[PDB]
């Protein structure tokens, strides 16, 4: 593997996703694949659909083999059913050889191929235990780690910078994508990339919630989620704190729910507070904080939408937070790394910060229930 050749291997943005070019079958068919750290299947369109240009035609691949079974995957607000097979895949921006992997080819779906997408499948990079129909279906990254002789690590940089593609470095860390220190937080549970959130701070003030409220369902790092998603009680506390700290006198209730845009003539970002998320260090007595500036949560659409949404379920660190950071998914060492992204800059200003260490003596030793 060549990590320098992986720089700028993603196209897209937080609106419609970050996607990787993949070549599938013999002769190769080129697909555009969403990079998804919140799922564990490699699944591609196998039939024509309204919101896609191309699909993988298994009949045109001489190396494709059918496993003889289907899989149905269901999400909140969507689903698909596909045939499960095996074929050879190359990733041209990083590798020089092909690898044998499992592939699901989608023949029916609901709410999956959304309006506006440039991708026609998904690359699930989470752990085997989320794979469907079961964890015996070898995941793409498990196949790649073995067959390509790479370390069990990948890293991601998203350069949309709250509006320039990105990089998926399969097998390691590219030094040219960050400056300063990488801070590591333990993976609490290897399914999603579940990490432990200790504290949220808005404009320098703590929310003063029990730290279990940040982890109750789970806190995860998910490149296939657009917004920062917060459990309802955390969301309401954040909204209250943003409205108190902001130099805008009035926000509508509809602004916070995404029903109304906030509009100005000639930049709103100086009128909003920084938002900080504190993560436990590998030493449990230390934490570090990842900080997003208003640029990452007051999103241009000049009119602006709120870049945070309430969750029925989990606390999700999605693409818009990830647009601030080089994120290292260190599966081998059971940890997630963060460094501030040099590309996370708008109008000459960094849109994110990282700092530490801070003491965890005032917080419980386990914030997951």
């Amino acid at each position, epitope marked *: 593997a060549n990590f320098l050749a992986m720089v700028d291997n993603l196209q897209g943005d937080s609106g419609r996703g970050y996607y990787l070019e993949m070549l599938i079958g013999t002769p190769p068919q080129k697909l555009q694949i969403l990079v998804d750290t919140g799922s564990s299947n490699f699944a591609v369109a196998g039939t024509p659909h309204s919101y896609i240009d191309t699909y993988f035609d298994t009949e045109r691949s001489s190396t494709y083999r059918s496993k003889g079974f289907d899989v149905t995957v269901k999400y909140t607000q969507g689903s698909w059913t596909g045939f499960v097979g*095996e074929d050879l895949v190359t990733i041209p921006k990083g590798f020089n050889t092909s*690898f044998l992997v*499992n592939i699901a080819t989608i023949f029916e779906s609901e709410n999956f191929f959304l309006p506006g997408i440039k991708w026609n499948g998904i690359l699930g990079l989470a752990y*085997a235990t989320l794979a469907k129909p079961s964890s*015996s279906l*070898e*995941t793409f990254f498990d196949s790649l780690v073995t067959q390509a002789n790479i370390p069990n690590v990948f890293s991601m940089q998203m350069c949309g910078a709250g509006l320039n593609g990105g990089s998926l470095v399969l097998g390691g860390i590219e030094p040219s994508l960050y400056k300063g220190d990488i801070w590591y937080t333990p993976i609490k549970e290897e399914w999603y990339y579940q990490i432990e959130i200790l504290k949220l701070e808005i404009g320098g003030q703590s929310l003063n919630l029990d730290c279990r409220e940040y982890n109750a369902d789970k806190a995860i790092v998910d490149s296939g989620t657009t917004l920062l998603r917060l459990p309802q009680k955390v969301f309401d506390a954040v909204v209250e704190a943003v409205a108190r700290a902001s130099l805008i006198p009035e926000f509508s209730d509809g602004f916070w729910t995404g029903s109304q845009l906030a509009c100005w003539t000639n930049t709103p970002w100086s009128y909003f507070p920084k938002i900080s998320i504190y993560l436990r260090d590998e030493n449990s007595s230390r934490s570090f904080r990842i900080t997003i500036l208003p640029q990452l949560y007051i999103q241009p659409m000049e009119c602006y939408r709120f870049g945070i949404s309430p969750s029925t379920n989990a606390l999700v660190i999605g693409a818009t937070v990830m647009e601030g950071f080089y994120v290292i998914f260190d599966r081998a060492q059971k940890r997630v790394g963060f460094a501030a992204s040099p590309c996370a800059e708008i109008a000459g200003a960094a849109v994110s910060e990282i700092s530490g260490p801070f003491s965890t003596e005032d917080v419980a030793s386990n914030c997951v229930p």
Partner: nanobody
Framework: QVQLQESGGGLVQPGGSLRLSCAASGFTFSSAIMTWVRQAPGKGREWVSTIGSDGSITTYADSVKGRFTISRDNARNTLYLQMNSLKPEDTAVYYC?????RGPGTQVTVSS
């Protein structure tokens, strides 16, 4: 729960041969991609060969092409590696892996 157990290694001279086996249980072997990897002390992990579930698609590292042959018997839940024309630099623990799990491996030593 998944079990992989390799056997068939040994100590051979240069130009010798071995037949490695891996017995599998606790999953549907007939639907599993299977891979052989090798690891020698002080060296990097080295992919050897992969075989698709029906046995028809096989791939090999350049370092072993034309010398080693991967195969499987789905009815017997067994993976094989036929190793010919063995060289000192093939010395390693050889292990089978599938879906992020691995067996403990079998030692291959090639020496005069």
């Amino acid at each position: 729960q998944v079990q992989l157990q390799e056997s068939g290694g040994g100590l051979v001279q240069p130009g010798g041969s071995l037949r490695l086996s891996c017995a599998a249980s606790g999953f549907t072997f007939s639907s599993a991609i299977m891979t052989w990897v090798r690891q020698a002390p002080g060296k990097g992990r080295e992919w050897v060969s992969t075989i698709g579930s029906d046995g028809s698609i096989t791939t090999y590292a350049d370092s072993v092409k034309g010398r080693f042959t991967i195969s499987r018997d789905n009815a017997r839940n067994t993976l094989y590696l036929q190793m010919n024309s063995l060289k000192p630099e093939d010395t390693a623990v050889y292990y089978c892996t599938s879906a992020g799990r691995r067996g403990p491996g079998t030692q291959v030593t090639v020496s005069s």
